[PDB]
Scaffold this active site. Structure first.
Site, PDB file in Angstrom:
ATOM      1  N   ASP A   1       0.835  -0.966   0.224  1.00 23.55           N
ATOM      2  CA  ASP A   1       0.185   0.004  -0.115  1.00 23.55           C
ATOM      3  C   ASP A   1       0.833   1.167   0.090  1.00 23.55           C
ATOM      4  O   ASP A   1       0.552   2.350   0.726  1.00 23.55           O
ATOM      5  CB  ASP A   1      -1.008  -0.114   1.426  1.00 23.55           C
ATOM      6  CG  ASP A   1      -1.813  -0.965   1.354  1.00 23.55           C
ATOM      7  OD1 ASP A   1      -2.471  -1.669   0.260  1.00 23.55           O
ATOM      8  OD2 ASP A   1      -2.037  -1.812   2.533  1.00 23.55           O
TER       9      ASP A   1
ATOM     10  N   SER B   1       2.179   6.859  -0.205  1.00 24.85           N
ATOM     11  CA  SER B   1       1.416   6.256   1.089  1.00 24.85           C
ATOM     12  C   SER B   1      -0.068   6.393   0.516  1.00 24.85           C
ATOM     13  O   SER B   1      -0.415   7.375   0.572  1.00 24.85           O
ATOM     14  CB  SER B   1       1.752   6.782   2.051  1.00 24.85           C
ATOM     15  OG  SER B   1       1.089   5.982   3.421  1.00 24.85           O
ATOM     16  N   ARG B   2      -0.899   5.248   0.187  1.00 22.74           N
ATOM     17  CA  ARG B   2      -2.080   5.316   0.006  1.00 22.74           C
ATOM     18  C   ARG B   2      -3.070   5.828   1.178  1.00 22.74           C
ATOM     19  O   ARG B   2      -4.101   6.353   1.056  1.00 22.74           O
ATOM     20  CB  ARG B   2      -2.655   4.135  -0.455  1.00 22.74           C
ATOM     21  CG  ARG B   2      -1.898   3.508  -1.842  1.00 22.74           C
ATOM     22  CD  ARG B   2      -2.399   2.290  -2.317  1.00 22.74           C
ATOM     23  NE  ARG B   2      -3.695   2.767  -3.126  1.00 22.74           N
ATOM     24  CZ  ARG B   2      -4.499   1.793  -3.788  1.00 22.74           C
ATOM     25  NH1 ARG B   2      -4.100   0.614  -3.938  1.00 22.74           N
ATOM     26  NH2 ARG B   2      -5.448   2.339  -4.563  1.00 22.74           N
ATOM     27  N   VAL B   3      -2.537   5.386   2.377  1.00 18.99           N
ATOM     28  CA  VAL B   3      -3.310   5.710   3.369  1.00 18.99           C
ATOM     29  C   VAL B   3      -3.125   7.171   3.788  1.00 18.99           C
ATOM     30  O   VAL B   3      -4.042   7.953   4.323  1.00 18.99           O
ATOM     31  CB  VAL B   3      -2.864   5.008   4.642  1.00 18.99           C
ATOM     32  CG1 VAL B   3      -3.564   5.397   5.829  1.00 18.99           C
ATOM     33  CG2 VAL B   3      -3.139   3.443   4.535  1.00 18.99           C
TER      34      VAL B   3
END
Ligand SMILES: Nc1ncnc2c1ncn2[C@@H]1O[C@H](COP(=O)(O)OP(=O)(O)OP(=O)(O)O)[C@@H](O)[C@H]1O
Ligand SMILES: [Mg+2]
Lengths: 363, 120, 118, 214, 132, 59, 117, 121
Positions: free
Chosen positions: A202, A227-229
Site C-alpha cells: 500500500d 502512501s495510499r493511507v
C-alpha cells in the site's frame, strides 16, 4: 506508526495495519528505515499503556550470520531487544527454511494482533525468499515462468502480506503492520518480483543510491515514495505543518535545473530554490537518531514558514541541535502540550511562532 | 509522373527544414509544391471519386498551378474545380472516361482549361 | 592492385564523406546545421550530394520511377564522383543529383530546373 | 542494441531536454534585460543622429570594417548570417581591412580572408554592453588602428526585426574629414578652435558602436 | 511652435524626450552657455560640469559627465552624455575625498596611469563647488 | 593636463568622468546596475596578414 | 562510521564523496555550456573535484612495469591529512597534473615544483 | 612512453571541441599532434614494417616534429623519411636494429637526423 524519521513521518506516514514497501537498490538505506523505526519504539514500549506499545518482529532471510549477529548487537546497545523478535534464516540454511521464515514470523506477530495489541514485522528481504522458493520449485520440476519463477510465486507474497491488517473493535482492535523489503537491480522496478510486491503493498519508500551520495540520508525519493493511507495515519500535530511541505518540495523538483544556471533567474523561481535547498537539508537525519513528534513539529514549522531562509545552508545541521536544546529549557511547556494533545491550537501556533522568531533573531 | 519518388524525397527535406533554418531557392521551391500535393492527397471517407475526376487533380499538382493557390483553399478548390469541368469542359470528362488515355491533343485542351481557371 | 590506385582513393573519399555525415546525424536532429562548423557543414551538403547521386534509374523498375533506365560505365562513374569530391559541382542543387544517370545528365538536369523556377 | 544501452542512452537524452528546456526560459529573462539596454541606446542614438539629419553629412567620392558579434554558441544562425553579409561587401573592396569583435565570428572570416583581420575582441557576449566598455573599445581603434585616417568606415550589427526573425544591418561612420564637406554645415554656429569635428568623430564612433552591440 | 523640445538621454537611462523647456544651462568648451525658446542653431562640446533644466516651476539641477549639445533649427536642443547625478542628496563629500586624495598619488604612480589622474582632478574639484 | 595630446580619445575623456562620478556618490544608493556598468573583462589582440597575432592584452 | 574511523576521518571522507558527486552531476553542463557558465562556488568545487579524483590514483610496486613509477605506500594517518588540506583549498594554486599518480601529499608539492623547472 | 595515454587525451579533447568553442594553445596543441599521431598509425595491409622503421616514425611523432606539417602530407612523409635514412643516416638504423635500445649517443645522432630532414623541402 511513528518511525522517528522526519522524511517519513512527515512525507510518507505509516499506519498500524498498513503494508508499506521498502524498495531500493543495494546499499541504499532500506534497513536503516526499518531499523530506526524499531529503535524509535522505546518511547512507548517502556510505558504502561498497551494499546500504545509496538512489538517488533524482524525476519532475516538470506543474510550471513555475521550480519545477523551484528544487527542483533545493535538493537541491544540501544536496549531494543526487550521488545524485538529475531527470526534468523541464514543463507547457508536449506532453501525451505528461507521459505517458511516469513510465514513463521507472520504467525508470531499475529498473536499480538489477535489478542488485541500492535506488532510490527519487517520482511528483509522478500527478494531472497522468492529466490529460495524458485530453487525448490525448479528442482521439483514444476513449470518455470518469467525469470524462472513458478506461477504461484505471486500467490506466495499475496498470501503473506494480506495477513497483516487492522482488526475491528469487535475482533480486538488488534493490528499487524508489514514493512517488506525488495532489492531492485539498477532501479528496475519493472522486474517480475518487484512488480508483484509493489502491486500488493500500500505504498513504497523508494531509495536511490544517487541521492545517498549527495548527502541526503536517508535517501528517500520524495517523488516516488508514496502512501495510499496518508494523513489517515499521521499525527495532526505534524499534519498541520506537513500538508504544505509536500507542495514546496514538489515545485522544487521542477525548478531544480535552474539552480545550475547563473543568477539570471527571476526572483519568483529563486524563492523556491531558497526553500528546497533548506527543506531538503532538514530531512537529512543521522542514523540511529530517531526524533519524537514533539521534536519534529518545531523543525517543520520553522522550515515551512521560512525562518531558515536567512540562515546559511551550511549551518542548517547545527541549527536543529541548538534549537531543540533551546525549547527544552525555555519553552518545555509547549513541547509537552504537543506530545499529549497531539494537535496545534491557534494559541500554540502563535506561541510556537514567537519562540521560533526569537531564537532565529538571537542567532 | 515521378510523383511517388518526389514525395519520398519531400519528407526528407521537409523534416529537415522544420528546424526553422533558412534554405535556398531550390529546396524551398520543392518544399512549397510538396505541401500542396500532400493536402491534395487528403480525402474524406465514404467519398469515392471516379478515375476521370482524379486525373484532373493530379495534373494541376505536378504542373504547379496549385502552388500559387493558398494552402487553406486547396480543399474548396477541389470541389469547385470539378464543377467547372462538368459545367464547362464536360467533353474532356467523357473522353477520359471511355478512352482512358490522354492523347497529345486532349493534353493541350486540358492545359488551357486549367490555366484559365487558376487565373480567375 | 585491381581497380587501380585512383579508383581506390576516390571510393575511400566517398566513404569517409558519407561516414562523417552519419556521425553527426544525432547532432542534426537535435540542434541543426546552424551549430555545425564551417568545415563540417560543407561536408554534409557534399555528402548529401554524393548519396543522392548514388541512386540510378532502373530499366526494369521504369514502371515505378517513370524514368527510362540509365546504364553507366565504370570508367565514367569514377571520374564523376572524383569531380564531385574536387568541389567542381558545389553550385549545382542537390535535387539535380537525385535519380540521375550520367554525370553529364546532372548538369543537364540542373539547367532544366532554372526554367521551371517561377 | 541491448536493454541497458537503450536505457542509458534514453536517459541522457532526457537530461539534454531538461538542459535546453530550461535554457529557453532563462533566455526570456536576458531578453527583457537587454530591452532596457536596447531602448536606452536607441533613444540616445536618435539624439545624436538628429543632428546629421537636419545637417546633410553624407560621404562624397583603404576602408575600416567592424563586425559586432558574440563569442558564445548555440544561438542559431547568427555567426553565419553576419559572416555572409560581410563576405558580400568584401567582394567589392577586398583591400578594405576588417576588425571583427568576437573570437567566434573571427574564425568565420579568418578562413576566407585571414589577411584583412588585424584586430579582434573577446569577452563581450557575457552580459549587456555599456558605454564604459564601448568607448574603451573604440579607443584602441584610434590608437593602434588609427581610424581617423580611413576615409570611410562601416559597421555591421544584427537588427532584431522580431523575436522570431533578425536582419543584418550596416551603418556608416562619417569621420572628421567628412564633417567639413557636409553640404549643410554653415547653418550651425561653431568655433574652429576646439577641434569640434575632431572630437565628434572620437565620440560618434563610440556611441554608434554601443547602439550596435546593445 | 512655442518653446523648445529637450532630449536629455544617456546610454543607460533617458530623462527628457521631446519635452518643452523654458531655459537650460549647460557648460560648453567655449564657455558656459544658455538656451531659451528660440535659439540659434549651435553645436558645442559639453565639458564635465553642471546642467540645470529650468521650468515655470522650480528648476532641477543635475551634474553632467560630458558630451555634445546641439540646438536643431526647428528649436530643439539635444543633450547627450554618459552618467548623470541628482542634486546633492546623491553625492557625499566623504566618498569624494577618499578617491580625490588618491588621485594626487596617481601622479606619483607610473605616468601611464597618472595621465588619467590629471583628468580626474578637474572633475573632482568641480564636485566641491556643487555643494554650494 | 592635455587629453587630446598624450591622453586618450574623447570617448575615454568622458569615460574617466563617468566612473569618477558614478563612484563619487553614496555607497547606499549605488545599485548593482552601476557596479557591472564599470566592470569589463575584454582583451584585444592584434593580428597580422598571415593569421599571426600579438601578445594578448587587457582593454 | 565515525565511531570507528574517527569523527575527523568521517567528515573528510564525506566531503570528498559529495565533491565527486556534484562534479559528475555537472558533467552535462561542462560539455554543453562550458566551464565559464558555472557559478563561483561551482567552478571552485569542480577544479577541486578534478584534483582529488586524480589524487586517488596511486602507483603500486606490483604494476611498476606498467606505470614505470616506483610503488608508493601511503599511511592512513597521512592520507586523511592530505585530502583534508586539499578540501580546505590550501593547494588551489598547484596544477592538476601534480596529483596524478602520486603517493603522499608532500610528493604533490615536490612534483608541482619539479615540473615548473 | 605515454603515447597510449596521450591518444586517450586526444579523444578527450576531440570530443570536447565538438561544442564548437574556440580552443586555447594547450587544447589545440595536443589536438594538432593527437590528430597526426592517429594518421601516422595508419598502415597499409600486406606491408609489415621492421622495428628499425617504426622507431624513427614514432619518434618524430611523440616529440612534435609533425605538428608543423599538413595532415594529407603525413602520408608521403613516412615513405620519404624512410628513404632518407636508408640512403644517408643508415648507420643509425643498423644500431637500433642490433642493439635494440637507444644510447646517449644514438639519441644525439637520431635527434639531428630528424631536424635535418624537417628542414629539407
Ligand atoms: N540514515 C543514515 N545516516 C547515515 N548513514 C547511513 C544511514 N542509513 C544507512 N547508512 C549507511 O548505509 C550503510 C548500510 O546501508 P543499509 O544497510 O541501510 O542498506 P541496505 O538496504 O541494508 O542494503 P543491503 O541490501 O546491501 O543490506 C552503512 O554503511 C551506513 O553507513
Ligand atoms: Mg539490509
Amino acid at each position: 506508526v511513528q518511525t522517528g524519521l522526519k522524511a517519513v513521518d512527515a512525507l510518507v506516514p505509516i499506519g498500524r495495519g498498513q503494508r508499506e514497501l521498502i524498495i531500493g537498490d543495494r546499499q541504499t538505506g532500506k534497513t536503516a528505515v526499518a531499523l530506526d523505526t524499531i529503535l524509535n519504539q522505546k518511547r512507548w514500549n517502556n510505558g504502561s499503556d498497551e494499546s500504545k506499545k509496538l512489538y517488533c518482529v524482524y525476519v532475516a532471510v538470506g543474510q550471513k550470520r555475521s550480519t545477523v549477529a551484528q544487527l542483533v548487537q545493535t538493537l541491544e546497545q540501544h536496549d531494543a531487544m526487550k521488545y524485538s523478535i529475531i527470526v534468523a534464516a541464514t543463507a547457508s540454511e536449506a532453501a525451505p527454511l528461507q521459505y517458511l521464515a516469513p510465514f513463521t514470523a507472520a504467525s508470531i506477530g499475529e498473536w499480538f494482533r489477535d489478542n488485541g495489541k500492535h506488532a510490527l514485522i519487517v520482511y528483509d528481504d522478500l527478494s531472497k525468499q522468492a529466490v529460495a522458493y524458485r530453487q525448490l520449485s525448479l528442482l521439483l520440476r514444476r513449470p518455470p515462468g518469467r525469470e524462472a519463477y513458478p506461477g504461484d510465486v505471486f500467490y506466495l507474497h499475496s498470501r503473506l502480506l494480506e495477513r497483516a491488517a487492522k482488526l475491528s473493535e469487535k475482533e480486538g482492535s488488534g493490528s499487524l503492520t508489514a514493512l517488506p523489503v525488495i532489492e531492485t537491480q539498477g532501479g528496475d522496478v519493472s522486474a517480475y518480483i518487484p512488480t508483484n510486491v509493489i502491486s500488493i503493498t500500500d505504498g513504497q519508500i523508494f531509495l536511490e543510491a544517487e541521492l545517498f551520495y549527495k548527502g541526503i540520508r536517508p535517501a528517500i525519493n520524495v517523488g516516488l515514495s508514496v502512501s495510499r493511507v496518508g494523513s489517515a495515519a499521521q499525527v495532526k500535530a505534524l499534519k498541520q505543518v506537513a500538508g504544505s511541505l509536500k507542495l514546496f518540495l514538489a515545485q522544487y523538483r521542477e525548478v531544480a535545473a535552474f539552480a545550475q544556471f547563473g543568477s539570471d533567474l527571476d526572483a519568483s523561481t529563486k524563492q523556491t530554490l531558497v526553500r528546497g535547498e533548506r527543506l531538503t537539508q532538514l530531512l537529512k537525519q543521522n542514523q540511529y537518531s530517531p526524533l519524537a513528534t514533539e521534536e519534529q513539529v518545531p523543525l517543520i514549522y520553522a522550515g515551512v514558514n521560512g525562518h531558515l531562509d536567512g540562515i546559511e545552508l551550511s549551518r542548517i545541521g547545527e541549527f536543529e541541535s541548538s534549537f531543540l536544546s533551546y525549547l527544552k529549557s525555555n519553552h518545555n511547556e509547549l513541547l509537552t502540550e504537543i506530545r499529549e494533545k497531539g494537535e496545534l491550537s491557534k494559541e500554540l501556533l502563535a506561541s510556537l511562532k514567537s519562540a521560533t522568531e526569537s531564537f532565529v533573531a538571537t542567532f | 509522373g515521378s510523383l511517388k519518388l518526389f514525395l519520398a524525397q519531400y519528407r526528407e527535406v521537409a523534416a529537415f527544414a522544420q528546424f526553422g533554418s533558412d534554405l535556398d531557392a531550390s529546396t524551398k521551391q520543392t518544399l512549397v509544391r510538396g505541401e500542396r500535393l500532400t493536402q491534395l492527397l487528403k480525402q474524406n471517407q465514404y467519398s469515392p471519386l471516379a478515375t476521370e475526376e482524379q486525373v484532373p487533380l493530379i495534373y494541376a499538382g505536378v504542373n504547379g498551378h496549385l502552388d500559387g493557390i493558398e494552402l487553406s483553399r486547396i480543399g474548396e478548390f477541389e470541389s469547385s474545380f470539378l464543377s467547372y469541368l462538368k459545367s464547362n469542359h464536360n467533353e474532356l470528362l467523357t473522353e477520359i472516361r471511355e478512352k482512358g488515355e490522354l492523347s497529345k491533343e486532349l493534353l493541350a485542351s486540358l492545359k488551357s482549361a486549367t490555366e484559365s481557371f487558376v487565373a480567375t | 592492385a585491381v581497380v587501380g590506385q585512383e579508383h581506390y582513393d576516390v571510393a575511400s573519399k566517398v566513404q569517409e564523406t558519407l561516414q562523417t555525415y552519419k556521425s553527426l546525424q544525432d547532432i542534426i536532429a537535435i540542434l541543426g546545421m546552424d551549430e555545425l562548423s564551417e568545415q563540417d557543414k560543407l561536408t554534409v551538403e557534399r555528402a548529401r550530394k554524393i548519396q543522392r547521386f548514388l541512386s540510378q534509374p532502373f530499366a526494369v523498375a521504369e514502371v515505378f520511377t517513370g524514368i527510362p533506365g540509365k546504364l553507366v560505365r565504370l570508367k565514367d562513374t569514377v571520374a564523376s564522383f572524383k569531380a564531385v569530391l574536387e568541389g567542381k559541382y558545389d553550385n549545382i542543387p542537390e535535387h539535380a543529383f537525385y535519380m540521375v544517370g550520367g554525370i553529364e545528365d546532372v548538369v543537364a538536369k540542373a539547367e532544366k530546373l532554372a526554367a521551371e523556377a517561377n | 542494441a541491448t536493454l541497458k544501452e537503450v536505457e542509458m542512452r534514453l536517459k541522457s537524452i532526457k537530461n539534454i531536454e531538461k538542459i535546453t528546456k530550461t535554457m529557453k526560459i532563462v533566455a526570456s529573462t536576458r531578453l527583457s534585460k537587454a530591452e532596457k539596454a536596447k531602448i536606452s541606446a536607441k533613444k540616445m542614438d536618435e539624439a545624436e543622429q538628429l543632428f546629421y539629419k537636419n545637417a546633410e553629412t553624407k560621404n562624397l567620392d583603404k576602408e575600416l570594417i567592424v563586425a559586432i558579434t558574440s563569442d558564445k554558441g548555440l544561438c542559431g544562425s547568427i555567426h553565419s548570417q553576419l559572416a555572409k553579409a560581410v563576405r558580400r561587401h568584401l567582394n567589392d573592396q577586398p583591400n578594405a581591412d576588417i576588425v571583427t569583435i568576437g573570437d567566434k565570428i573571427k574564425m568565420q572570416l579568418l578562413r576566407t580572408h585571414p589577411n584583412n583581420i588585424k584586430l579582434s575582441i573577446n569577452g563581450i557576449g557575457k552580459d549587456a554592453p555599456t558605454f564604459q566598455e564601448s568607448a574603451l573599445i573604440a579607443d584602441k581603434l584610434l590608437s593602434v588602428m588609427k581610424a581617423g585616417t580611413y576615409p570611410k568606415i562601416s559597421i555591421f550589427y544584427n537588427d532584431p526585426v522580431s523575436s522570431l526573425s533578425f536582419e543584418p544591418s550596416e551603418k556608416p561612420i562619417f569621420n572628421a574629414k567628412t564633417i567639413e564637406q557636409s553640404p549643410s554645415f554653415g547653418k550651425f554656429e561653431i568655433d574652429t578652435d576646439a577641434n569640434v569635428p575632431r572630437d565628434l568623430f572620437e565620440y560618434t564612433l563610440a556611441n554608434q558602436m554601443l547602439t550596435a552591440m546593445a | 511652435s512655442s518653446g523648445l523640445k529637450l532630449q536629455f538621454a544617456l546610454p543607460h537611462e533617458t530623462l527628457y524626450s521631446g519635452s518643452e523647456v523654458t531655459q537650460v544651462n549647460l557648460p560648453a568648451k567655449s564657455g558656459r552657455i544658455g538656451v531659451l525658446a528660440n535659439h540659434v542653431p549651435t553645436v558645442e562640446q559639453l565639458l564635465p560640469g553642471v546642467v540645470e533644466v529650468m521650468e515655470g516651476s522650480n528648476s532641477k539641477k543635475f551634474f553632467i559627465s560630458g558630451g555634445f549639445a546641439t540646438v536643431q533649427p526647428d528649436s530643439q536642443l539635444c543633450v547627450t552624455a554618459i552618467e548623470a547625478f541628482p542634486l546633492e542628496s546623491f553625492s557625499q563629500e566623504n566618498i569624494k575625498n577618499l578617491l580625490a586624495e588618491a588621485k594626487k598619488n596617481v601622479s606619483s604612480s607610473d605616468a601611464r596611469e597618472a595621465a588619467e589622474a590629471a583628468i580626474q582632478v578637474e572633475v573632482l574639484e568641480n564636485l566641491q563647488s556643487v555643494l554650494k | 593636463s592635455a587629453w587630446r595630446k598624450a591622453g586618450i580619445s574623447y570617448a575615454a575623456y568622458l569615460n574617466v568622468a563617468a566612473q569618477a562620478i558614478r563612484s563619487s556618490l553614496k555607497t547606499e544608493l549605488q545599485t548593482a546596475s552601476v557596479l557591472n556598468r564599470s566592470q569589463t573583462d575584454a582583451f584585444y589582440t592584434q593580428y597580422k596578414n598571415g593569421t599571426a597575432a600579438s601578445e594578448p592584452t587587457p582593454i | 562510521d565515525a565511531a570507528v574511523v574517527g569523527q575527523e576521518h568521517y567528515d573528510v571522507a564525506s566531503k570528498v564523496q559529495e565533491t565527486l558527486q556534484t562534479y559528475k552531476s555537472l558533467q552535462d553542463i561542462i560539455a554543453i555550456l562550458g566551464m565559464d557558465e558555472l557559478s563561483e562556488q561551482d567552478k571552485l568545487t569542480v577544479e577541486r573535484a578534478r584534483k582529488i579524483q586524480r589524487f586517488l590514483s596511486q602507483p603500486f610496486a606490483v604494476a611498476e612495469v606498467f606505470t614505470g613509477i616506483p610503488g608508493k605506500l601511503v599511511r592512513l594517518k597521512d592520507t586523511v591529512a592530505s585530502f583534508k588540506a586539499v578540501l580546505e583549498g590550501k593547494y588551489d594554486n598547484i596544477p592538476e597534473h601534480a596529483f596524478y599518480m602520486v603517493g603522499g601529499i608532500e610528493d604533490v608539492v615536490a612534483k608541482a615544483e619539479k615540473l615548473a623547472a
